[PDB]
């Protein structure tokens, strides 16, 4: 029932916009069965209503080829109603339309640039001659004739707003020419369709603001007053201002904008005077919508605000919203990043009584935003917007708009080198050659920076699953844990249990623990946040734990997000280690981590991965299932894995066929992944002096080989050493053994 306002049902007056065949600017075609249903006669005049409260008058005719659910009209009427093909309009009879006495029309500047002839005789007289065309004030119609077709705007009619252009009706075109930019602003007016990804939020806002106006008798009979307060909170750039503008534009209300910082005034009494003036102006311009940007800055908590001016501003706002004199027919909307910073009195009923959350756009939501922003642009066949949406993990609608603009600029950069630029005007062939392709979008993606998580920006090491050698089982589990909950939400719903979201990697150094994490950042279509261990700690008393809450809050906002903790042993300890650990601050940080990972809050799609080197010191509460339930041991690579490691490093660099990688793995019993990579580096680095000697020999004769030979490997193995000592190995082996011994019941089988 929450989405009851979004739904629509078939009605006789509702008709789908369809292409015209022979219809002019003044007639529309309707099929006979629905004309009988609507009791409409051929030649009758009707009223057509479009989006953003646009009205048009046309003559209804009969067409046997038109569908019962479709109405035929030309492009002129479509532009008049601000509708496109496939839109829904309403048709009703328009009786008592009288013959016009005097109508005033003004041409559009861009349609008359260079036109010096008499507009009346050339265009208006043949267009209206014995045609009895019905017109409405504000209508835009196009007339052919002369050397170029000219558009006109109906600015005045007598009678108004509906009249018939009779033969005795006086038609005059004198007046100030209309400006193209003004018409373009009205054409590009923000409406409900421009908002993407906020269907439920738009539904709530619609029911609160627009529904009371449409059916006031319903509210009078039910005996309640609709809410008069709206509070939209979300990350910056999410589109709260655009939602407010769309609401104020489609509904017949005046949009009045208030900025928090500009209200601030050093003079005593000026700020609340400005607030009063704004409210009185909005009351004068009723219906109106008052929008306040950054309500948190203008109105903080009075008890915590030492400044007198801000406190008096809050009190004035309270009195303006509620007092002895009740404001009527005025809606106040506010946008704030942090809703809890607002004064608690301002959250009361009757004053911002309802709060609506505008969250970070979803994948389909950001795809819809991209579709809306790219509708005016030209798109090639190669480009897929869904790919761009998928690659934009944390981008916001403003970021998407900037991305589209930058990509169009990149197309301009692509075509700039073609033109020699000496001509004042570009030749038409190069003009047509220009187009936007997928490569421009990819370049914009590389250049662009997400704003949801500009604070957590870091270079991408760009590792692939092919880079990692061995660990085939670990690769599959890492891929399944992130992809299954997001790609298959319904599979878990059918089984009715939540997915696991905890992984810990423990093993000897150089075995690929952080290498696996870096591969997750690329392949998965989820946000990735990397935290160095002691990065969160702070000298101040309660700020070490405040950093932990901020990290988990950002991950929850950007869900699905992968939260990777490198060297987890630094922040997680067995607790009660010593009294000198910052006066118990180290113990207190662990407790904050415990609540964030598993507390009394709904579990979002946040996956926590920890890469620890010494796992025995970690708090047992951290390793509990539900926080880090999957403990994966990354050991020293065995003989089979070492071959894969050697092949993985060697695929990029050409090698001689004489080299036997299998023989290297057998001798390299105890080497880790890093130790083998050191042999990889030494082999290529060796004989690099010979490489210069080869090219020097080329210079000598004028006046070493792409494949690395067997000989190069033999010299490199001489310097090879094992970094992980056997004593170190035993420590990890013991911990993994305890896990197997703890479970018991080896080879568990249900009894037959």
Ligand X SMILES: Nc1ncnc2c1ncn2[C@@H]1O[C@H](COP(=O)(O)OP(=O)(O)O)[C@@H](O)[C@H]1O
Contacting residues toward Mg ion, per CB under 5 A: 514
Q: Does 318 bind ligand X (CB under 6 A)?
A: no
Out of a second copy, Mg ion, ligand X, none, what residue 514 binds, judged by CB under 5 to 8 A for its kind, is: Mg ion
- Say whether residue 388 binds ligand ATP (CB under 6 A): no
Q: Is the peptide bond before 82 cis (omega within 30 degrees of 0)?
A: no
CA angle 417, 419, 420 (to 5 degrees): 100
Task: Considering the complex, state which of residue 261 and residue 746 has its C-beta at the smaller distance from a second copy.
Answer: 261
Letters for 704-743 (x = contact with ligand X by CB under 6 A, - = none) are ----------------------------------------
Quote the CA–CA distance of 729 and 418 in Å, as a whole number: 63
- Binding site partner of 237, from Mg ion, ligand ATP, ligand X, none, Cβ cut-off 5-8 A by kind: ligand X
Listing DSSP states for 366-384 in one string gives: HHHHHHHHTSSS---SS--
Does residue 615 bind ligand ATP (CB under 6 A)?
no
For 451, half-sphere exposure in the C-beta direction (CA atoms, 13 angstrom radius) is 15
CA dihedral (100, 162, 51, 106) positive or negative? positive
Q: How far is the CB of 327 from a second copy (least distance, A)?
A: 6
With beta carbons less than 8 A apart as the criterion, state whether 654 and 707 touch. yes
Count of Cβ atoms closer than 10 Å to residue 395 Cβ: 26
Residues 6+ apart with CB under 8 A from 696: none
- Where do we find the tokens 């403990």? 631
Among 28, 60, 105, 195, binds ligand X (CB under 6 A): 195
First to last CA, the chain: 51
288 touching ligand ATP, by CB under 6 A: no
The helix (H) or strand (E) run that includes residue 314 is: helix 308-321
Tell whether residue 239 is a contact of ligand ATP (CB under 6 A).
no
**Interacting residues of 82 by C-beta distance below 8 A, sequence separation 6+:** 50, 51, 52, 54, 187
**Distance, CA of 6 to CA of 747 (rounded, Å):** 56
Q: At 745, is the secondary structure helix, strand, or coil?
A: coil
The whole-angstrom distance between residue 577's C-alpha and the CA centroid of its chain comes to 45
Contact call for residue 610 and ligand ATP (CB under 6 A): no
Binding-site residues for ATP, please?
A: 236-242, 337, 373, 510-515
Out of ligand X, ligand ATP, Mg ion, none, what residue 648 binds, judged by CB under 5 to 8 A for its kind, is ligand ATP
- Please list every residue from 8 through 67 that binds ligand ATP, using CB under 6 A: none
Q: Which of residues 498-557 bind ligand ATP (CB under 6 A)?
A: 509-515
Residue whose CB is less far from Mg ion, 361 or 507: 507
- Min dist CB 188 to a second copy, Å, is 12
Number of Cβ within 10 Å of residue 3's Cβ equals 12
Q: Which does 351 bind (CB under 5 to 8 A by kind): ligand ATP, Mg ion, a second copy, none?
A: none
Residue 708 binding target from ligand ATP, Mg ion, ligand X, none, CB below 5 to 8 Å by type: none
Among 239, 324, 321, smallest CA distance to 278 is for 321
Packed helices 513-523 and 472-487: angle between N→C axes, nearest 10 degrees? 30
Q: How far is the CB of 719 from Mg ion (least distance, A)?
A: 23
Q: Pick from 60, 198, 481, 515: which binds ligand X (CB under 6 A)?
A: 198
Between residues 189 and 711, which has the closer beta carbon with respect to ligand X? Answer: 189
Q: Is 100 in the site for ligand ATP (CB under 6 A)?
A: no
Would you list the DSSP string of 599-629? Answer: SSS---SEEEEEEES-GGGS-TTTTSTTTS-
d(CA 138, CA 160) in angstroms, rounded, equals 11
- Of 81, 143, 346, 369, which lies in the binding site for ligand X, with binding defined by CB under 6 A? 369
Closest CB 514 distance from ligand ATP, rounded Å: 4
Residues 632-691 that bind ligand ATP (CB under 6 A): 637, 645, 648, 673-674, 677
Of a second copy, Mg ion, ligand ATP, none, which one sits near residue 469, judging by CB under 5 to 8 A according to partner kind?
A: ligand ATP
Q: How far is the CB of 607 from ligand ATP (least distance, A)?
A: 18
x/- contact string, 440-469, with ligand ATP (CB under 6 A)?
----------------------------xx
Q: Is 442 or 722 the residue whose CB approaches ligand ATP more closely?
A: 722
Closer CB to a second copy, residue 392 or residue 613? 613
The stretches of 96-179 forming alpha helices (DSSP H) are: 109-112, 119, 125-128
d(CA 132, CA 58): 11
438 CB-side CA count, 13 A: 10
Identity of the residue, 198 or 515, whose beta carbon is nearer to ligand X in the bound complex? 198
**Chain residues 387-446 in contact with ligand X, contact rule CB under 6 A:** 397-398, 401
Beta strand extents in 552-605 (DSSP E only): 561-566
Calpha distance 289→208 (Å, rounded): 12
**For residues 503 and 507, what is the distance between their CA atoms, to the nearest angstrom?**
13
Q: Is 108 in the site for ligand ATP (CB under 6 A)?
A: no
Residue in 240, 393, 518, 588 binding ligand X, rule: CB under 6 A: 240
339 sits near ligand ATP (criterion: CB under 6 A): no
The entry of Mg ion, ligand ATP, ligand X, none that residue 275 binds, CB within 5 to 8 Å by partner kind: none
For ligand X, which is the closer residue by CB, 400 or 686?
Answer: 400
Positions that interact with ligand X (CB under 6 A): 194-198, 236-242, 369, 372, 397-398, 401
Please report, as ranges, the residues that interact with ligand ATP according to CB under 6 A. Answer: 468-470, 509-515, 611, 613, 637, 645, 648, 673-674, 677
């Amino acid at each position: 029932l929450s989405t009851a306002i979004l739904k629509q049902k078939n009605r006789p007056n509702r008709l789908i916009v369809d292409e015209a065949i022979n219809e002019d600017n003044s007639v529309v075609s309707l099929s006979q069965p629905k004309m009988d249903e609507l009791q409409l006669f051929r030649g009758d005049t009707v009223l057509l209503k479009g989006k953003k409260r646009r009205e048009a008058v046309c003559i209804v005719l009969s067409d046997d080829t038109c569908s019962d659910e479709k109405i035929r009209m030309n492009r002129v009427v479509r532009n008049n109603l601000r509708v496109r093909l496939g839109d829904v309009i309403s048709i009703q009879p328009c009786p008592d339309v009288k013959y016009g006495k005097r109508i005033h029309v003004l041409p559009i500047d861009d349609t008359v640039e260079g036109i010096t002839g008499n507009l009346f005789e050339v265009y208006l007289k043949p267009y209206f001659l014995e045609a009895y065309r019905p017109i409405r004030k504000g209508d835009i119609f196009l007339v052919r004739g002369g050397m170029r077709a000219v558009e006109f705007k109906v600015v005045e009619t007598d009678p108004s707003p509906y009249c018939i252009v009779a033969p005795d009706t006086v038609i005059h075109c004198e007046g100030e020419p209309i400006k193209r930019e003004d018409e373009e602003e009205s054409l590009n007016e923000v409406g409900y369709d421009d908002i993407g990804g906020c269907r439920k939020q738009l539904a709530q806002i619609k029911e609160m603001v627009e529904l009371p106006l449409r059916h006031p008798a319903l509210f009078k009979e039910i005996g309640v007053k609709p809410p008069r307060g709206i509070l939209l909170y979300g990350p910056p750039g999410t589109g709260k201002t655009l939602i407010a503008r769309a609401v104020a534009n489609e509904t017949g209300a005046f949009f009045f904008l208030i900025n928090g910082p500009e209200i601030m005034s050093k003079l005593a009494g000026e700020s609340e005077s400005n607030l009063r003036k704004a409210f009185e102006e909005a009351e004068k311009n009723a219906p109106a919508i008052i929008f306040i940007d950054e309500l948190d800055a203008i109105a903080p908590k009075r008890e915590k605000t030492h400044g007198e001016v801000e406190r008096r501003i809050v009190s004035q706002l309270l009195t303006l919203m509620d007092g002895l004199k009740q404001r009527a027919h005025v809606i106040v909307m506010a946008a704030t990043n942090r809703p809890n910073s607002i004064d608690p009195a301002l959250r009361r009923f009757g004053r911002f009584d309802r709060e609506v959350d505008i969250g970070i756009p979803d994948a389909t939501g950001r795809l819809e935003i991209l579709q809306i922003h790219t509708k005016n642009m030209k798109l090639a066949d190669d480009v897929d917007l869904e790919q761009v949406a998928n690659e934009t993990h944390g981008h916001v609608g403003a970021d998407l708009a900037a991305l589209c603009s930058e990509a169009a600029l990149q197309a301009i950069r692509k075509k700039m080198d073609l033109i020699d630029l000496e001509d004042e005007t570009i030749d038409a062939e190069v003009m047509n050659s220009l187009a936007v392709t997928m490569d421009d979008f990819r370049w914009a993606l590389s250049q662009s920076n997400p704003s949801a998580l500009r604070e957590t920006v870091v270079e991408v090491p760009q590792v692939t699953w092919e880079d990692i050698g061995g660990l085939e089982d670990v690769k599959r589990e890492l891929q399944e844990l992130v992809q299954y909950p997001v790609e298959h939400p319904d599979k878990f719903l059918k089984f009715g249990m939540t997915p696991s979201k905890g992984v810990l990697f423990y093993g000897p150094p150089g075995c690929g623990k952080t290498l696996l994490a870096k591969a997750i950042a690329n392949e998965c279509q989820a946000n990735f946040i990397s935290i160095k261990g002691p990065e969160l700690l702070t000298m101040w008393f309660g700020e070490s734990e405040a950093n932990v809450r901020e990290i988990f809050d950002k991950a929850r906002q950007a869900a699905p997000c992968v939260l990777f903790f490198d060297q987890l042993d630094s922040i997680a300890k067995a607790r009660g280690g010593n009294i000198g650990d910052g006066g118990g601050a180290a113990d207190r940080v662990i407790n904050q981590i415990l609540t964030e990972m598993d507390g009394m809050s709904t579990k979002k799609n946040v996956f926590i991965i920890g890469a620890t080197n010494r796992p025995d010191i970690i708090d047992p509460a951290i390793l509990r299932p539900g926080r880090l339930d999957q403990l994966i041991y990354i050991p020293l690579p065995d003989e089979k894995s070492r071959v894969a490691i050697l092949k993985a490093n060697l695929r990029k660099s050409p090698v001689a066929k004489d080299v036997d990688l299998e023989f290297l793995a057998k001798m390299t019993n105890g080497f880790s992944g890093a130790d083998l990579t050191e042999i990889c580096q030494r082999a290529c680095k060796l004989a690099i002096r010979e490489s210069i000697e080869s090219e020097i020999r080329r210079e000598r004769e004028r006046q070493p080989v792409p494949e690395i030979r067997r000989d190069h490997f033999e010299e490199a193995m001489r310097f090879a050493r094992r970094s992980v000592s056997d004593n170190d190995i035993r420590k990890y082996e013991m911990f993994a053994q305890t896990l197997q011994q703890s479970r018991g019941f080896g080879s568990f089988r249900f009894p037959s």
